[PDB]
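Forum: Protein Structure Q&A
Topic: Joint prediction for protein chains with partners

I've read a bunch of threads here and the consensus seems to be that you should model interacting components together rather than docking separate models afterwards. I'd like to see that in practice. Below is the full input, 77 residues plus whatever partners are listed. Could one of the regulars post the assembled result?
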Amino acid sequence: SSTKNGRDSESKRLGAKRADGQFVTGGSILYRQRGTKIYPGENVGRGGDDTLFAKIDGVVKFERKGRDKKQVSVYAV
RNA sequence: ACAUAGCAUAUCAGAAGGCACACCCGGAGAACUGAAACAUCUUAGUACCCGGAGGAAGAGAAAGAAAAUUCGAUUCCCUUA
RNA sequence: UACAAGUAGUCAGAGCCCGUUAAUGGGUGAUGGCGUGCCUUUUGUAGAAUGAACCGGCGAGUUACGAUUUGAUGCAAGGUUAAGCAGUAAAUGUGGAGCCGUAGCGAAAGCGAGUCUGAAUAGGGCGUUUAGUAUUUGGUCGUAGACCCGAAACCAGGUGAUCUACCCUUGGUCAGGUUGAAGUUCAGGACUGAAUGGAGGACCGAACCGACUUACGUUGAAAAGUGAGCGGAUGAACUGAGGGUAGCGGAGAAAUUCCAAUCGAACCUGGAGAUAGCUGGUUCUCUCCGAAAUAGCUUUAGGGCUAGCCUCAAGUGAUGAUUAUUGGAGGUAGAGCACUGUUUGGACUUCAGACAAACUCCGAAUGCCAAUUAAUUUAACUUGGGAGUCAGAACAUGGGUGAUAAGGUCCGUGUUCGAAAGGGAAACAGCCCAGACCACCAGCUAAGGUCCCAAAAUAUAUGUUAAGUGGAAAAGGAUGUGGCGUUGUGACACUGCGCCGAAAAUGUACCGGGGCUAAACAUAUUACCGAAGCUGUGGAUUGUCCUUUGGACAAUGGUAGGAGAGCGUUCUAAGGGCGUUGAAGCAUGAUCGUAAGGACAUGUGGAGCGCUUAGAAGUGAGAAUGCCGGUGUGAGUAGCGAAAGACGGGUGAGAAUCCCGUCCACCGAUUGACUAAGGUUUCCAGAGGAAGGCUCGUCCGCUCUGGGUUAGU
RNA sequence: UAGGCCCAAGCGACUGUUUAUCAAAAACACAGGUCUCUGCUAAACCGUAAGGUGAUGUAUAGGGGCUGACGCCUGCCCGGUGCUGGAAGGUUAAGAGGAGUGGUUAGCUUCUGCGAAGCUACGAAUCGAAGCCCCAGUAAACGGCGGCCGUAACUAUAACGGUCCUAAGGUAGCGAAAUUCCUUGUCGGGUAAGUUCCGACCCGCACGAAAGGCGUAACGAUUUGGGCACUGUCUCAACGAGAGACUCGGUGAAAUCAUAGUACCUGUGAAGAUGCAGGUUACCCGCGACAGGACGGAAAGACCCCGUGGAGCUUUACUGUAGCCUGAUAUUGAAAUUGCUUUCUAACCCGCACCACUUAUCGUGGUGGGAGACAGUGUCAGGCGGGCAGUUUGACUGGGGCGGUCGCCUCCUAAAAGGUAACGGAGGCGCUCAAAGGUUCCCUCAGAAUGGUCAUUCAUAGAGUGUAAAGGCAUAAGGGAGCUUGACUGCGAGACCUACAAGUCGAGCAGGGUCGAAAGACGGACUUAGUGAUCCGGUGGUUCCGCAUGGAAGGGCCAUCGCUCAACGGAUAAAAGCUACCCCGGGGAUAACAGGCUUAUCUCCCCCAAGAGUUCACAUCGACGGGGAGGUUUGGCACCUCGAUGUCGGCUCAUCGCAUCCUGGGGCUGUAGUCGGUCCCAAGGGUUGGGCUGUUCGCCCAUUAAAGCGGUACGCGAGCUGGGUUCAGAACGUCGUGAGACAGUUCGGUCCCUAUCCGUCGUGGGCGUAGGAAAUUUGAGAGGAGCUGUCCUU
RNA sequence: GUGACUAUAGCAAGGAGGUCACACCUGUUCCCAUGCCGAACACAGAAGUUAAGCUCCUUAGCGUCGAUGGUAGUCGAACUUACGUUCCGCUAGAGUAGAACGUU
Ligand SMILES: O=C(NC[C@H]1CN(c2ccc(N3CCOCC3)c(F)c2)C(=O)O1)C(Cl)Cl
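Posted by a regular:
Agreed with the consensus. Here's the joint model:
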């Protein structure tokens, strides 16, 4: 009567890692993701795996890109 | 054949057995155990057992130790650790 | 104290009797309220889970050496000795070999306040902290049995065949009867018949040896028997004596059967205190704090290790929390069909309508992350020493699974129990209220209630219900009844409360009981009762602020566990004391302390003990189916071991039982006579009656005191 | 005092033997049969050896394996595997051999290179037996003996055919059997009644020829069925005798025991209360008796599970071993002929003869004979070797076994941050690319409508993206083309994740470059799977070390390689099973019974009413659907009990519910009467005796007014039995290589207790009831009884 | 021309605009190019033409934004098995914006 289910993956902690309006140091991770759910703004860059990191230590502010898309910019403190 | 096995007399405080469930030196020599199982390994060359001593026993007089400008049998104690 | 329902106490309390360490006295206790022992183990025990009959004594984290951290002390870029020698088994002197430290980095060569990687201080890792060290107090860990008790087992060296298995050597026993093979002998004619013969793991059947059935016994007469029957009973029989085979072995007509009441591998001593991730137990008091039942890995799943949650010390120092505000990320509930599927009815792609955990054109409530924002509060982190936890439960709620079963099972969030007493739910860990420092015969409230049991309203205003509905349950039925609205005295939609549907087993038995027509319901007013909550008073310990070192405020449930302060016992040193005009101890007492406990007085006792301050421990017992001793209960109970005794006469302190006599009874292939093994004086006579004899005893196989065994065969 | 007999059947031929103490048998032995080894220092066995037994025997003898008198027989196959035999080959050890490399250094003389002899670290080709591969044989060696269809001179059936497979397809006999699940097979016999028995048939799940087949006179403390006789076994009990019991005198235990002033009921509770709640009942003390409760007492559950617990047994589990065979070599000599061969004598050997020690089957010596460099013995090597030994034989798990799974990736569950479980719902991975990477430029899809791959309009977007799924992408991350190797070297501020080890991202910096005119981009692929600690071994470099010194051997560092170590944090280089012969430590953390919750299943009741019932839905019946009750069955959960809660069915005794079988009272009928059907009230009483089966249920027989259904631990084992059920023996079929297991089936098999409390049944005493008595009573309350037939009359 | 901007910008319909700017338009002579095609790409250029593009103005047919009010849904609380209070407040749908704001 045995079944052929019962196996999942490992959950990979995947989501926003800094809050809008927080002071970040210049290499912190800002958002992890599969494919661009949010885009790299100004002073921010995406690497392989598309994770968003801040190049320079400033403030992080989530913004809008058109009607649908979004973006993560890092102003200067 | 010579002879040598035997055989029979004689001498000998020769030997024998015990004993301290202590010590020591050889012969032979487990297992439970630890390895969180188990076999190499460990317990352990331990327990028991057998033989020989002796008041001690064994070791002992460099075919050694070392690497300085050397020491000079063995045993044992502290360290090296 | 003989009308009463009892974890045997506790609070209140008359009545009766006494009279102390003399102080809100002691003993008893009609009666009323409350109240289901203690440990252990558990999610959870009154538990019908464990364990303890009771009393007394004994009985469980210790020591040696190392490491680590903490307190104290001594010195300080230094600290310090080890063996040895001297010394009273002592300090102590001496003994600088050795160790730690002031310098680190690298695998290393080797550099050095730097170094390694590197082509490159480029960057980066590790250093430049600039005080260590020695001894000792405590915590903890390591190696030794290492908190105590407890295996089944394994190995080595011996002791066992007097039982039982098999064999060997030499002996013995089997009442009686029945049948009638071969063989032979005769008469015949190879074979027949009659005599004879006495064969047989033959037949019947005692001893003998077994053990089929069945009853009895099962704290037995007996650790395998007795009664009645039953089988072999000249043989593969039974049996005595002397011998032999021995445990990694031996014997087996073979059953895992026997090897000294024990055998899938004997018994004894040693390794040995084997090991036990398992059960059980683990001894004095108080004060403060106070969990977990989770993640990960695991030859792992009732174990362990790191992390999460607790505790103590030091430090940093606002970094903690709830709220307000703003910003944000994210796709749930909801909803919708634009995507992917599913789908109804038409029209002929399209109108209208539906479904979705793995659909989304959309999209909350909450929760989450922030600011360096404000407001109330006072935690938070780090580095250290120490742990415990890894079996969780119910309740509400969001889901999976199951069957929109389960006091089911698995996860998110919360609460309580765990570890939490008090009030309500009748009783009832988890439900509602509420967190016990202690005393009080004071007050206010909380859930919940106010007819009586049972504290407080037979309150108040307005209505509903007649079923005892209240005070267990549906589909469906139906001129029950009230409200309200729409309708042509009839008909309707919504509704309030009721009826039927409605059957279970010891006893009413689905309000806790009486009882209730209001003491049930719906809405609103008051009053009051009601807890260990809060308040008032007094008290006790911790704290922090100094109004005035005074007060003032705050805290004080607790299991695993962490920390502190103490009591008591034996001994030791020093000091100072008591004591034959009475020590220790024991008995009684109405005494002082917050507890462990400390005094005092009187009896008993007869010769040693306190007290202060330190030191050292075989330092505290209610639990181990703990060990040893005593003593209960069961209880005047079961039993008193196969069977015929009676009377007379004695002896006697005492006679169912001892002696003598008469009668009677039982055995008689034996209950008689004799001997081997074995026992080893039990044999006889005089005396005895403490213990033994399953009762008694004047008796004896018992006790005391003297005697008894004679060999050339 | 002293045989019951007869008719049949299964097993075993017979007498015998067996589990001391739960099994006496169908088990063992057996006389007989057959296979096999053994030439005598026999084989086999004991002991390390000497030495023995075998046997003071010798192939008509000795050991071992199977079967089991007697009679008739004993069929077939040699794949595989065991055994005997053969030696062509293939393969294989020590030992022989020593081409040949490396180390060192005299010397060379370059300057890291050459290299004598030695000493030394390793070696190659060749020679090296037995074994294994290979070739045959063997079946009273181990074992094993098929399917699927069609078809008349046998109605349906299949003598006969077609096909595939192999070692070979089960012969003679027997057959629902100690073997048959279905199944109490079908038939006949026996009985009034036959799950047993007998006789047959044959769909032989799953008979069958020496683990023998079939049959058999005699024998059996064997198993089974049936008669005659006989009976207290029984209907259905009665009385008498003795012992215990009871009362008296004497003596006088024991297990047990937290303290007890110890009631019932309905509840509640760790879900089965003397002790809690609420009610109901009970004056204080005994004595005799019974056995419902104290989850009564003994025995730290023999069942079940768990110990990384033991023990015994098995095997083609792992690693070993006593032994046995085979080679080189030492003891170990000569001759011939070519290391294989053959001859000789002195080594060695003689359980050979004689002689002497010696008025000894020991031994020693001497002499002959035989054997002879072999044997035996020592060291070394190979092989066989459950004969024996030490051990391993996973976990999760709605108990365990069987089934499945175990590591990584993507979804949903997942409750809009992240994380989040189940043996919840779906899938994938253990790679692939030298261009499917980088860069630079250009380009835009899928499908329809149109016409006959092509052309155009329409076409956010439905394609493609290597590969799952999700998230993204028309900045293109999709397509095409040029150029190249960044699929770089040393690193890395900071961050996410995180128990640890790991994992992921990363600006920027230096060395070197590729593309581009340049800014710039580039440390693989649109993102996320495609992987495995350490230890050890190998290889390439190197700066390090190299035990007096110089080299080297060997190490270290850097770079790579070797793990379905897939049980994927990997226990070792190396590992399966049974126990019903079992053993210890634990658990109600976890099963079997009973209890508890649930009600899927079960029993019953109802709603709607399409219909059937001559028309008529509702006398009776009730499709498709719907809603309940109960707590008897089959289950689910796993809450109490594993320091013990004893099973099914009968016997004794009952008691309760009502969902009524009979008797009592009614309604409606498709009720003429008798007789019925279906509802309704009713629990007072009653509710049979046999056959078969362990049986309950179930069928049958003969009656009756009727032959009720349920609860009470499927009531009751301190009241009884012990037939079945799961103890140890033995056997059948089947499975297993095996030890052994059941789907099974069959024959045999120790049932302990002296009653303390409550409870019940009897029977006394103390006090009470306002003086002490005797007698007669009322009766609150409680208990008993309560059934029915058939005849005649109307 | 070139940036910002959440389609309120778009899709659509009409109608109007010529070389002074924007194209279409003329050809391969080279620069460069088509897996064929001076189609595109790009080079030399004036003619002929707004027809088309483009831009400017008008239309609310689709597209998009979208209030209010109520409802669903819940945070929390209190009786209890799903109603009652208080706050937050949707989707859908009707009223509406709307034929683009805007730098250098
Ligand atoms: O001691 C013993 N049991 C102690 C406990 C357990 N139990 C008990 C009762 C009945 C059974 N059944 C019924 C059906 O399943 C098999 C047999 C059972 F398995 C155990 C009981 O009542 O008490 C036995 Cl060994 Cl005598």
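The first strand of chain A starts at residue 29 and ends at 31.
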